[PDB]
Amino acid sequence: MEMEKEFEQIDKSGSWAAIYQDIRHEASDFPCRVAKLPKNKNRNRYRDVSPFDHSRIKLHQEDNDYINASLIKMEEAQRSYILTQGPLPNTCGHFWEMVWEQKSRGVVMLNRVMEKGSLKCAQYWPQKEEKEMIFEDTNLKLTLISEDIKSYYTVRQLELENLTTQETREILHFHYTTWPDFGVGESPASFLNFLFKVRESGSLSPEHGPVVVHCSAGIGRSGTFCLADTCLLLMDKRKDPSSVDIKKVLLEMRKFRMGLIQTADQLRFSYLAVIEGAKFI
């Protein structure tokens, strides 16, 4: 659109770093008192990445209500997302408790469990049908029903059972497995194909709870996913689709969780994905 002209402008002038730093400087600052309580030290993967008190997801069971997760409610775009860190070995039961209580239908994972030889996330779902997972703290059972492994992502059908009530729910697990180890993708094509697969699944529909999106810290790749999805919604929905300002959308999102988009390359990649995605739609 006109967006692609502004994009070439930013590239010519080499000012992605400058735009990104303005975003960091204008971003909202809200308290994260609960996240920083001493008893929550082992529920945070990165001490530098915390949910704001006002938007944090609260667990319902009689125990510590804390999980490192934030509700991002985009009013104009009419979509909500839960952004969360990759679960830790002691928070997988909390993670699936949140999926249950928030009535999510899909989980979007944007990292490999290990990248460049380092763990980014616990193995929080079963890899084999016959070896289900029981989370004794939150009283939940999780079974792999089937999985469709494709070249750039995997979709799994998971069965989540509340062992307290014996109610069961089918959760769709969308695992984007091909984000580059370093930097961002030269092209947003496979990321966009992945987004549209998630959309096509129904998981983002308002009849469900918000999709749960995560990477390692729940702000960088996760922020890219939600930013692009929301901008593409706004471009398809607004009377004047050229009025969608990606930087403004990102600042709005950052009222709900700190640090969304962690690098100027991720910002540039987001612009690129929205540009290419808008052509498609």
Residues in region 108-137 near Cl ion by CB under 5 A: 111-113
Helical packing angle, 264-280 and 3-13, nearest 10°: 150
3-state secondary structure of 133: strand
- Return the ∠ at Cα 58 (arms to 55 and 63), rounded to 5°: 150
Catalytic residue among 32, 92, 215, 231: 215
Q: Catalytic: 92? A: no
CA–CA separation, 111 and 100 (whole Å): 22
CA distances 141 to 154, 159, 162, 232, Å, are 21, 8, 7, 36
Q: Report if residue 203 touches Cl ion, rule: CB under 5 A.
A: no
221 is known to lie in a ligand binding site = yes
C-beta closer to Cl ion: residue 141 or 221: 221
Using alpha carbons only, how large is the chain's radius of gyration in Å? 18
Piece in contact with Cl ion (CB under 5 A), picked from 10-18, 60-68, 193-201, 266-274: 193-201
10 Å Cβ neighbour count for 90? 11
β-bridge partners, 107: 173, 212
218 is known to lie in a ligand binding site = yes
217 is known to lie in a ligand binding site = yes
Shortest CB 23 distance to Cl ion, Å = 8
Shortest CB 98 distance to Cl ion, Å = 19
Q: Report if residue 239 touches Cl ion, rule: CB under 5 A.
A: no
Piece in contact with Cl ion (CB under 5 A), picked from 13-21, 45-53, 57-65, 195-203: 195-203
Q: What is the contact surface with Cl ion in residues (CB under 5 A)? A: 24, 37-39, 74, 76-77, 111-113, 150-151, 199, 215-216, 221, 244-245, 248, 259
